[PDB]
Design a binder for this molecule. Structure first.
Ligand SMILES: [Zn+2]
Lengths: 102, 49
RNA sequence: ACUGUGAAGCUCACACGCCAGUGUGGGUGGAGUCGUUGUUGAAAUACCACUCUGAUCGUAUUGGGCCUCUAACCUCGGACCGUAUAUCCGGUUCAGGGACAGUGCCUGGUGGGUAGUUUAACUGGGGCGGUUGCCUCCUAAAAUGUAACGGAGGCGCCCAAAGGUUCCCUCAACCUGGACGGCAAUCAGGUGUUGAGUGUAAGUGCACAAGGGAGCUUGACUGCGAGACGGACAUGUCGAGCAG
RNA sequence: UAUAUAGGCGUCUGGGGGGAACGCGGGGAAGUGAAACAUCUCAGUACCCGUAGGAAGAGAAAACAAAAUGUGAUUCCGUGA
RNA sequence: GCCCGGAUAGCUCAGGGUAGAGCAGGGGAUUGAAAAUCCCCGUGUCCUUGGUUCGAUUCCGAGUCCGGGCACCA
């Protein structure tokens, strides 16, 4: 299917510049930035409900924004991908950061 | 500088109240100490910056 | 996850390849690999999304490097004309260079070629040498202060305890007895009133301990401060006590 | 040299130079002061160039002001200081 | 203050699952002795601390001693 995969613009090599999150949104998971500065979550795909996971996706995004490193330089959220199992593209717009369910 | 100048900031309000000197070879860690904080009005833990 | 808009199995080609085999497309034929697979830090080469390392394709933007062409611009190359006199000047035309060079604005480099200036004081004359601020002692003439290139030294730090508080203790030296052990290590008994020690020079002090040991701890605070010391001035120093 | 132009003839009308001070537009020092000196001052002074007039320059808001229904072109004096 | 580079045996110097190479030093061998050559050794906190990783000389951070160019109006 699909998931929530974001590319945080942070340098994972630096010890200080490490992003770790933990959020809960029913509508306690653990998120760790890869060694190549990527973040992946668990979500559905395009062929699913509309507002069921919209609240779930919004809560997780706020966790990443609140956990942004202080020393991060440049754009923080560069890309978010919701591409299906066989479908290409389907990239979520990174500009949406408040009141997703609308 | 062996003995550099350090500033102690309150844990709660984060105000910088005191400045002193410590040996950074004998005490490699950030100095932790309880000092009076005028803003909070009471003795609070202070930490090096 | 897959297959008849046709799997494997063989064979046809290509690229990588430690030719061990991988990946791509083609054909015959049609009914497959796949989950804990057993070792493993990591399990599936079931598959998917993002991505790293190199390698390669395309469209968009984007910068540099050259070769050309002549029409800008250049020629103290030639020939005519103004012009009777003209190695000036200008114009016409041929021959060459040619978006280079020259010039304007902006910008980095070299720059005694030139210009404006600096290059201390003390001092038994000046130079050479030495010194310049702070702390301690003597000279210093028993209050305070007192000069000389007079006599001796030290400082431009250190300590998170070597600061605060409560409680406890008494050294150095000598004598006597003890396995290595001796003048001197650790043990034991006696005499021992300061001769030891006080982070660091000297002086004044400290055995009542300011010296030795231990438990807790951050007052190495905030707002203030009667009254004084010292002083050309600017500096410097002590302080009971009130509240949090 | 063709269009023509540069140029050449003829004729009218102006210009040139001087002046003590004042005006406008440009170029622009140093001694000196800082108890030295380079930023700074001296000073846009001294001097130099171009120009006028009886005076010159400026002048009729693409202005001040601050919620007041406030002034209302320019120039020059006194305060503001 | 900014940007790069160097530190690895006694000496010089190459290097995510390697500590190595050439000279030195010790014994063995060749030679009639001697020299010149071949064999086998000993030699190492990979500047020092920490981090990522199953695993670091190798990647990252800080610090130490050098070197080069530039910036520096209490
Ligand atoms: Zn506080």
């Amino acid at each position: 299917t699909v998931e929530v995969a974001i590319r945080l613009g942070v340098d994972p090599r630096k010890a200080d510049q490490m992003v770790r999150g933990t959020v809960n949104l029913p509508h306690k998971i653990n998120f760790r930035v890869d060694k190549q500065a990527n973040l992946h979550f668990i979500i559905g795909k395009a062929s699913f409900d509309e507002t069921k996971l919209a609240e779930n996706y919004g809560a997780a995004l706020d966790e990443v924004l609140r956990a942004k490193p202080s020393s991060s330089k440049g754009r923080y959220l560069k890309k978010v991908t919701v591409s299906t199992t066989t479908g290409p593209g389907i990239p979520v717009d990174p500009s949406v950061t408040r009141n997703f369910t609308e | 500088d062996v003995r550099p100048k350090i500033t102690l900031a309150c844990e709660v309000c984060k105000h910088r109240n005191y400045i002193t000197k410590k040996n950074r070879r004998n005490d490699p860690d950030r100095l932790e100490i309880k000092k009076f904080c005028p803003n909070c009005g009471t003795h609070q833990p202070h930490k090096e910056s």
